[PDB]
C-alpha cells in the first residue's frame, strides 16, 4: 500500500514546476501572438506550415503541461482524471509529435523546391491545396496516434487492485506490443523524419553554396538557417524522451530497482522539460533571426497590452 509513491526531491519538484511555468508562459505567449501575427506570393504557404507548428506547440503547452505537472510530477497517484483524460492525453501528445515532424519534413521539401526550382515553386501547391495538405498532416497524425487510445489505460496496481489509491494511468497492453508501438513512434515520429529533414538541409545548404535579384538569397539563407536551428533543436530535445520510453520497456523487472526507479523519474523530469523547451523554442527562433517578425510581434503585443 502507498508503495506506488515516487521518491523525488521537493527541491527538484519546485524546480521543474517553476521551469514548466516559465516554458508555459513563454511558449503560450510566443506561439499565440505568432498565430495572431500570421493573419502573399510564397511566404503564405510557409506561414500555413508555421501555423500548424505553432498550433501543435500551443496544444502541447496549453493542454499537456498542467496534466504533467499535477499528476506526473506532483501527485503520482491516484489518477484523478478519467480514462478519456489519459488516452486523450497520450493521443494528443503523439498526434502533436507526428504533426510537428511532418510539418518539418514538408518544410524542408518546400524549401529545397523553392531554392532549386523556382519555376515549379509557384505551381506545386496553391494555398487551398496547401491547407488541404495541412489538414492531411493533421488527420494522418491522428491515424498514427490511434494506438495510444488502445495502448494506454487505467490499472489499479495497489497489489490487490481494490484500493482506490492504486488507480494508475498506465499502458494496459503487454510488454511485447508495448515495445512494438514505442518502436513505431520512435521510428516514425523521430528517427526517419528528422533523418530526411537533415538530409534535405544538407542538400539545401550545399546547393545554396552552389547557387551563390541578388538580395533574395539573403532572405532564403535566413530561412535555411532557421530551419537548421529548428531541426537540431528538435532532435536534441526529443532524443532522451524516446530513449526514456525505450528505457521504460527494455529493462527487465529483476533489473528494475529503486535506484533505477528514481533515476527513471528524474530522467522523466529532465526529458519532459526538454520536450516543453522544444515546444517553446520555436517563436524565439523566429523572432531572433527574422527581425521583422520581431517588430510586428512587438507591434501586436503593443496592440493587446
Amino acid at each position: 500500500n502507498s508503495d506506488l509513491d515516487v521518491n523525488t526531491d521537493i527541491y527538484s519538484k519546485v524546480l521543474v514546476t517553476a521551469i514548466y511555468l516559465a516554458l508555459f508562459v513563454v511558449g503560450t505567449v510566443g506561439n499565440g501572438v505568432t498565430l495572431f501575427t500570421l493573419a502573399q506570393s510564397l511566404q503564405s504557404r510557409v506561414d500555413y506550415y508555421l501555423g500548424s507548428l505553432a498550433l501543435s506547440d500551443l496544444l502541447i503547452l496549453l493542454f499537456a503541461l498542467p496534466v504533467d505537472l499535477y499528476n506526473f510530477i506532483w501527485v503520482h497517484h491516484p489518477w484523478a482524471f478519467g480514462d478519456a483524460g489519459c488516452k486523450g492525453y497520450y493521443f494528443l501528445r503523439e498526434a502533436c509529435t507526428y504533426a510537428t515532424a511532418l510539418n518539418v519534413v514538408s518544410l524542408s521539401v518546400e524549401l529545397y523546391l523553392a531554392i532549386c526550382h523556382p519555376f515549379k515553386a509557384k505551381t506545386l501547391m496553391s494555398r487551398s491545396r496547401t491547407k488541404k495538405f495541412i489538414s492531411a498532416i493533421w488527420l494522418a497524425s491522428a491515424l498514427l496516434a490511434i494506438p495510444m487510445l488502445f495502448t494506454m489505460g487505467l490499472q489499479n496496481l495497489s497489489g490487490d487492485g481494490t484500493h482506490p489509491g492504486g488507480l494508475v494511468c498506465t499502458p494496459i497492453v503487454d510488454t511485447a506490443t508495448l515495445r512494438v508501438v514505442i518502436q513505431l513512434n520512435t521510428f516514425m515520429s523521430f528517427l526517419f523524419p528528422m533523418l530526411v529533414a537533415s538530409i534535405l538541409n544538407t542538400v539545401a545548404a550545399r546547393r545554396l553554396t552552389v547557387m551563390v535579384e541578388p538580395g533574395r538569397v539573403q532572405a532564403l539563407r535566413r530561412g535555411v538557417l532557421v530551419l537548421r536551428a529548428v531541426v537540431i533543436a528538435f532532435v536534441v530535445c526529443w532524443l532522451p524522451y524516446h530513449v526514456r520510453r525505450l528505457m521504460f520497456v527494455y529493462i527487465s523487472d529483476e533489473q528494475w530497482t529503486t535506484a533505477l526507479f528514481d533515476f527513471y523519474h528524474y530522467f522523466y523530469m529532465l526529458s519532459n522539460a526538454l520536450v516543453y523547451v522544444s515546444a517553446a523554442i520555436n517563436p524565439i527562433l523566429y523572432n531572433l533571426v527574422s527581425a521583422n517578425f520581431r517588430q510586428v510581434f512587438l507591434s501586436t503585443l503593443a496592440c493587446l497590452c
Binding site: H76, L157, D253, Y268
Partner: peptide, 5 residues
C-alpha cells in the same frame, strides 16, 4: 519494481 509512468 517497474515504473508505471
Amino acid at each position: 519494481r517497474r515504473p508505471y509512468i
